[PDB]
């Protein structure tokens, strides 16, 4: 039987320049090439892309953050390319030491460069958030994407900005490095008495696992009713078809209740944002209110 | 009770076993043979959990913990109070999970839809058996499996992880995490996109899928498509669980040192392994 | 007591309300629950029916308000098996033709789905300027074979989802000259043939026809897709 995981026959037509609405067409690129590779799994068309002031600012600010970390890695490598590749994952740009507190007066080689990199990352992320809002606004769509994005920004802001400030030291922030930021994750737990016993950490996991649970359910469900065009969900919301009915009835007969075509995407957006929403809270409280989650757990 | 559109679908047929003996519903739930099987394994499993609670001396659900047999018992049987209950409960759980999957298949047949859902559920089952069966057997003792307790099974994760230093450095463990993160990223984006189209700005008419394509092309220059994202989410979630079972079946079986040592084959290559400077 | 214990209690309260909201939101279709005789069920659950919400459909196609008075808007050829509730309802006639069970179809609008510009979302490739087969086997010309290993026709065209650039149906020319649409998700394109495991060669003619050779309405799609998916259960007797 055909499973509909990979397209059997690809079809290609004139490129789709996309809806206009109130989008400033001056800032849209030309269409890119078609990818027969991607055509087997999804759409083959690449581009066009929208590049405005926020996009340019975010892209440029982002590359500076990347380049700031870069020159530091080359400096740790002694400017030797061989050493650069050998120890690439071990290089790390650390925040200032605790002795500098929240001051920006740390010299470049003792966390001053980390502060610069963090600035470029701050401008890149937030300008990109403003991008996801204005792109939705230009097309007249809701701002669900932007609000869903904030939940990720919330954990990111806590990890390296809000929580360090409340602790009173940039040294509480995370370092820029592949392995180093893993070690920072490991020590953060040990210092704070086992994050397994941070309830907002357990909730965060329930929603991470729950995200993989729900999307496997939903992805499998839509492919199972794609033989009825189930993936055309907007028109199934406006005019319920046998796809939506069979999908709902499968889960009703299975676990006792079911969703609608629209309602399942509210389960989805909430299951996913709650991951970084609960997570940001758990980290914010660690060290500011609770020094030992295991001990704190025994009194409750 | 039925949904307004449900009756026309409640036809006979589609079973795999028992013909029309168990081909009926209890409220919303469809029974079928494997529904009876599920109820049987479940009820027996819970009884043995309650029984273990009596032997343990507590009925607080946050303290109940059914432990597997001690390492000295190897892969043989153990008395009920010394790990036999964990063994029987594990059999029951496995029977219930499988029966649940075969029940889903009967429901797929009666609705004339694909079998993607139970197929995806089997990945979860695989990961469970990886921790409670495949890995213990390959290591030669049931004691290596994890205990059935709300909190004692988290300690097992912590004990098992730290036996190999920082488990983060397990390369398969990285890949699995990446799929879990990327999955929640894709799930949030998908749900937000459909809702943003079906619920536009005030004073706007419902959007079309073309708006969804156009939004994501304007944003990152590529749209995967209405069909491709559901394929994608199915593959991100299953791949996440696949490499999760992979990163554990190899731990303690073909890899015994700390996982950070696994990354020395890159550091220590005889050409650049000696060049002075750098971290190493 | 402390700021941590209060935060975790506040969240659980927040989460209970969120589940409540999410659940009522997922009751805008199919509710209120009915008895098997169509009358409203006495037990509707602990969650109340949500308050109506309105979509303004594009292209001047009206407004949908959900929840609202439900209706199948079509006859159902089923009869009860038991006096007690919870048992199957057996087809009274031909389930594939009566469109019941796995052959069910919903009385959707007898209008084609439109793209963002007001044009038909699905068109035969012979009416889609510029579209072609860019990868994989081109099924046009190939013979179509049923689960009985007999030939029912040959592919004559592909109906494509233009905005998505996706093949959705095969147009198959039967032995009598007429054509029928086959869901792309139910066919198997091979090197020398197209094989349809869901139907037997002599059941292709029964596939509902379309009233326009260059467009297919939502209703027609549901009737076509349901019939074909229904063959899996109801065409099994003569399946080799
Ligand atoms: C997966 C890798 C590890 C592991 C590591 C962790 C870590 C680390 C954490 C958890 C957490 C949890 N784990 Mg564990 N867990 C494992 C295997 C399991 C198995 C199993 C049968 O294999 C089960 C049932 C559970 C169950 C649970 C929940 C108590 C909790 C939230 C999970 C969740 O929402 O998931 C997504 C599922 C859903 C959203 C659907 C709802 C599922 C509900 C929540 C499951 C309830 C099970 C019930 C308590 C036990 C069975 C009842 C029987 C009738 C007797 N774990 C293995 C050993 N698990 C978190 C926690 O808070 O623990 C206290 C946590 O921090
Ligand atoms: C020894 C290690 C510790 C531990 C220490 C921690 C710490 C410390 C943290 C977590 C956190 C998390 N842990 Mg824990 N964790 C442990 C054990 C576990 C176990 C387990 C089976 O035992 C599991 C399943 C988890 C699971 C999880 C997640 C639920 C959670 C991360 C949320 C998330 O999505 O972050 C990923 C998402 C983000 C970080 C959001 C970032 C968004 C930003 C804005 C995007 C940046 C874009 C960038 C600039 C672009 C780059 C390039 C692009 C191409 C342009 N942990 C043990 C006990 N864990 C986090 C948490 O919230 O805990 C409550 C956290 O901080
Ligand atoms: C949540 C707790 C910890 C943490 C613990 C882990 C663990 C544990 C793992 C990662 C992994 C990764 N982390 Mg980290 N990570 C944290 C915060 C971050 C932040 C951030 C803005 O705060 C960034 C940019 C990253 C970046 C990354 C990538 C190098 C990689 C895959 C991410 C991914 O799938 O993204 C989404 C995917 C795409 C955009 C594509 N981490 C916090 C501090 N991270 C994995 C890895 O491979 O590390 C080398 C891994 O094993
Ligand atoms: C101190 C702890 C160590 C560590 C040691 C381990 C160990 C040890 C393990 C993991 C495993 C995992 N870790 Mg790690 N890990 C750590 C840090 C992390 C961090 C982090 C941010 O720091 C992250 C993101 C992760 C992420 C993860 C995942 C890749 C994986 C767990 C998911 C899984 O397998 O699900 C798979 C899903 C299941 C097993 C659930 C199956 C459910 C069954 C089939 C059905 C249940 C039905 C239920 C009972 C019915 C009840 C009905 C009720 C009505 C609800 N780890 C640290 C460094 N990690 C685990 C793994 O890979 O397991 C394979 C594992 O064993
Ligand atoms: C809220 C739950 C999950 C989530 C959601 C999320 N992420 C998002 C969004 C949303 C809703 C966006 O709208 C935004 C985006 O445009 O995605 C395509 C984004 C985004 N999430 C990204 C990454 C990312 N998200 C992550 C995690 C998560 N994102 C959570 C698991 C992670 C990690 C570490 O797990 C990473 C690495 C970017 C691809 C993108 C933001 C791009 C950006 O800020 O670029 C600026 C930098 C340069 C241009 C250079
Ligand atoms: C494989 C990708 C992800 C996934 C997918 C997935 N799960 C699924 C499905 C799919 C596609 C289903 O169709 C099926 C379902 O119906 O979901 C609603 C299911 C399901 N996933 C579930 C849970 C679950 N999935 C998880 C994970 C995942 N599921 C993956 C991340 C997790 C975790 C820990 O991450 C959990 C907890 C169930 C809600 C449901 C299966 C229900 C089922 O099998 O019911 C029959 C069994 C019973 C009714 C009870 C049996 C009880 C036992 C006899 C005794 C107890 C055994 C257990 C060992 C106790 C230990 C408890 C402690 C560890 C706390
Ligand atoms: C697009 O189309 C879709 C739908 O329709 C349109 C959906 O509806 C769904 C379903 C999804 C949801 C409703 C979202 C909420 C679900 C979550 C968060 C998953 C987590 C689920 C739970 C926590 C609930 C788990 C439930 C159970 C384990 C069931 C309890 C089991 C019981 C009572 C026993 C089972 C009964 C029998 C075997 C029969 C009885 C036997 C006898 C012998 C009497 C999806 C995915 C979808 O794509
Ligand atoms: C040839 O190579 C060249 C040289 C070209 C390169 O460029 C190679 C470079 C690389 C390969 C770089 C590789 C990059 C990494 C390994 C980085 C890895 C990153 C992480 C693991 C993520 C860590 C991020 C977490 C933190 C700590 C985020 C902090 C964000 C804050 C919210 C911002 C804080 C703001 C501050 C301090 C002040 C700014 C101003 C304000 C008003 C707020
Ligand atoms: C090749 C250039 C592309 C660059 C990629 C940037 C990085 C994105 C990474 C992960 C998120 C996964 C994105 C896929 C989520 C799409 C959300 C969705 O629902 O899309 C459906 C469809 O696009 C509506 O028509
Ligand atoms: C911390 C942020 C988490 C909240 C995200 C919740 C998203 C649902 C609300 C979407 C509202 C969209 N709207 C109406 C403004 O267009
Ligand atoms: C949006 C879907 C909501 C799903 C709710 C799942 C609840 C999981 C409970 C996990 C228990 C967490 N805790 C606090 C005990 O550590
Ligand atoms: C995580 C535990 C909570 C999940 C419970 C799921 C609900 C089961 C089915 C409810 C409907 C049953 N009812 C009332 C119609 O008999
Ligand atoms: C119903 C099929 C079950 C297959 C796998 C079940 C896992 C059993 C694990 C414990 C075995 C204990 N044993 C064999 C020593 O009695
Ligand atoms: C042996 C691993 C676990 C087996 C449990 C049974 C899973 C359900 C069967 C999957 C149905 C899907 N398919 C395509 C195989 O028919
Ligand atoms: C006394 C401290 C209280 C902390 C409350 C934490 C849980 C509240 C979460 C609500 C999130 C709502 N929102 C805006 C993201 O949709
Ligand atoms: C039982 C008390 C509940 C108090 C908390 C209420 C939770 C609100 C849930 C979010 C509402 C969803 N919305 C409209 C923001 O998308
Ligand atoms: C994490 C899952 C959240 C709990 C599930 C809530 C379902 C409750 C509603 C069940 C009743 C449905 N019914 C019978 C009225 O159709
Ligand atoms: Cl822009
Ligand atoms: Fe969807």
Short mmCIF file of C-alpha atoms in Angstrom, two decimals, chain B residues 1-14 23-27 109-113 198-199 203-211 213 217 223-228, chain C residues 29-31 33-34 36 41 53 55-59 70 72 74 76 78 86-91 100-102 104-106 113 115-117 121 163-164 166 168 229 232-234:
data_model
loop_
_atom_site.label_atom_id
_atom_site.label_comp_id
_atom_site.label_asym_id
_atom_site.label_seq_id
_atom_site.Cartn_x
_atom_site.Cartn_y
_atom_site.Cartn_z
CA UNK B 1 -23.77 9.00 22.81
CA UNK B 2 -22.60 9.85 19.28
CA UNK B 3 -21.27 12.89 17.50
CA UNK B 4 -23.76 14.43 15.09
CA UNK B 5 -21.83 12.91 12.14
CA UNK B 6 -20.74 9.65 13.77
CA UNK B 7 -23.55 7.16 13.09
CA UNK B 8 -22.77 6.57 9.41
CA UNK B 9 -19.27 5.36 10.39
CA UNK B 10 -20.40 2.86 13.07
CA UNK B 11 -20.70 -0.07 10.67
CA UNK B 12 -19.68 -3.69 11.34
CA UNK B 13 -16.38 -5.06 10.13
CA UNK B 14 -12.68 -4.33 10.26
CA UNK B 23 -17.31 -5.52 17.41
CA UNK B 24 -19.15 -2.93 19.49
CA UNK B 25 -18.68 0.26 21.51
CA UNK B 26 -18.90 1.16 25.19
CA UNK B 27 -19.82 4.83 25.08
CA UNK B 109 -9.71 -0.59 9.16
CA UNK B 110 -13.29 0.25 10.17
CA UNK B 111 -12.69 3.90 9.19
CA UNK B 112 -10.85 3.08 5.96
CA UNK B 113 -7.90 5.30 6.87
CA UNK B 198 -8.09 30.66 10.26
CA UNK B 199 -8.20 33.57 12.75
CA UNK B 203 -12.03 43.07 9.91
CA UNK B 204 -10.33 40.42 7.76
CA UNK B 205 -11.78 37.43 5.95
CA UNK B 206 -10.42 33.96 6.64
CA UNK B 207 -7.07 33.44 4.94
CA UNK B 208 -6.13 30.73 2.44
CA UNK B 209 -3.28 28.19 2.48
CA UNK B 210 -1.61 30.46 -0.09
CA UNK B 211 -1.24 33.00 2.72
CA UNK B 213 2.96 29.60 2.01
CA UNK B 217 8.42 32.36 2.12
CA UNK B 223 7.55 26.79 2.58
CA UNK B 224 7.44 23.03 3.04
CA UNK B 225 3.73 22.74 2.23
CA UNK B 226 0.52 21.61 3.88
CA UNK B 227 1.43 17.95 3.35
CA UNK B 228 5.17 18.29 3.98
CA UNK C 29 -18.07 20.43 15.52
CA UNK C 30 -20.23 17.38 16.13
CA UNK C 31 -21.87 18.58 19.36
CA UNK C 33 -23.99 14.58 21.42
CA UNK C 34 -26.89 12.59 20.02
CA UNK C 36 -28.42 6.70 18.14
CA UNK C 41 -28.24 12.78 24.52
CA UNK C 53 -17.70 32.06 16.58
CA UNK C 55 -15.44 32.94 10.11
CA UNK C 56 -15.77 35.24 7.11
CA UNK C 57 -14.99 32.97 4.18
CA UNK C 58 -13.01 34.58 1.34
CA UNK C 59 -14.34 35.08 -2.18
CA UNK C 70 -25.97 20.24 12.80
CA UNK C 72 -26.04 15.42 7.68
CA UNK C 74 -28.21 13.25 3.21
CA UNK C 76 -28.04 7.20 5.76
CA UNK C 78 -28.16 1.98 8.01
CA UNK C 86 -23.27 0.80 21.34
CA UNK C 87 -23.55 -1.78 18.55
CA UNK C 88 -22.84 -1.50 14.82
CA UNK C 89 -25.47 -0.31 12.37
CA UNK C 90 -25.63 -2.64 9.39
CA UNK C 91 -25.94 -1.31 5.82
CA UNK C 100 -21.76 4.57 4.39
CA UNK C 101 -19.03 3.29 6.68
CA UNK C 102 -15.54 3.49 5.17
CA UNK C 104 -18.88 7.59 3.79
CA UNK C 105 -18.79 11.10 2.36
CA UNK C 106 -19.76 14.45 3.86
CA UNK C 113 -11.96 24.88 -3.44
CA UNK C 115 -6.75 29.34 -4.19
CA UNK C 116 -5.82 32.75 -2.78
CA UNK C 117 -6.67 34.50 -6.07
CA UNK C 121 -7.29 25.08 -6.60
CA UNK C 163 -0.70 26.58 -5.35
CA UNK C 164 0.97 23.48 -3.85
CA UNK C 166 1.10 18.58 -6.12
CA UNK C 168 -3.93 14.96 -6.30
CA UNK C 229 -11.30 4.12 0.56
CA UNK C 232 -10.61 -1.67 1.05
CA UNK C 233 -13.35 -3.20 3.22
CA UNK C 234 -16.13 -3.80 0.69
#
